[PDB]
Amino acid sequence: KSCCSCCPAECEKCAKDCVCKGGEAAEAEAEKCSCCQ
Ligand SMILES: [Cd+2]
Ligand SMILES: [Cd+2]
Ligand SMILES: [Cd+2]
Ligand SMILES: [Cd+2]
């Protein structure tokens, strides 16, 4: 598991800054966020 689940495992994008920054529901559940993709 990446950190969240919205993004694969090695999203370079989160690897910096956890790009999704939901804060609360950071998980986001939706398998596939646009920021990391
Ligand atoms: Cd994420
Ligand atoms: Cd990510
Ligand atoms: Cd993350
Ligand atoms: Cd993301």
UniProtKB/Swiss-Prot annotation:
It comes from the Eukaryota. The modification Phosphoserine is found at S2. Keywords: Acetylation, Copper, Metal-binding, Metal-thiolate cluster, Phosphoprotein, Zinc. A divalent metal cation 7 binds at C20, C33, C35, C36. The keyword Metal-binding applies. Abundant in a subset of astrocytes in the normal human brain, but greatly reduced in the Alzheimer disease (AD) brain. A divalent metal cation 6 binds at C7, C11, C14, C36. One of its GO terms (cellular component) is nucleus. A divalent metal cation 5 binds at C4, C6, C7, C20. A divalent metal cation 4 binds at C3, C4, C14, C18. GO terms for biological process: activation of protein kinase B activity; cellular detoxification; cellular response to cadmium ion; cellular response to copper ion; cellular response to hypoxia; cellular response to oxidative stress; cellular response to reactive oxygen species; cellular response to zinc ion. GO terms for molecular function: antioxidant activity; cadmium ion binding; copper ion binding; metal ion binding; metal ion sequestering activity; protein kinase activator activity; zinc ion binding. Residues 1-37 are annotated as: Alpha. Belongs to the metallothionein superfamily. Type 1 family. Binds heavy metals. Contains three zinc and three copper atoms per polypeptide chain and only a negligible amount of cadmium. Inhibits survival and neurite formation of cortical neurons in vitro. This is Metallothionein-3. The gene is MT3. The chain holds residues 32 to 68 of 68 of the full protein.
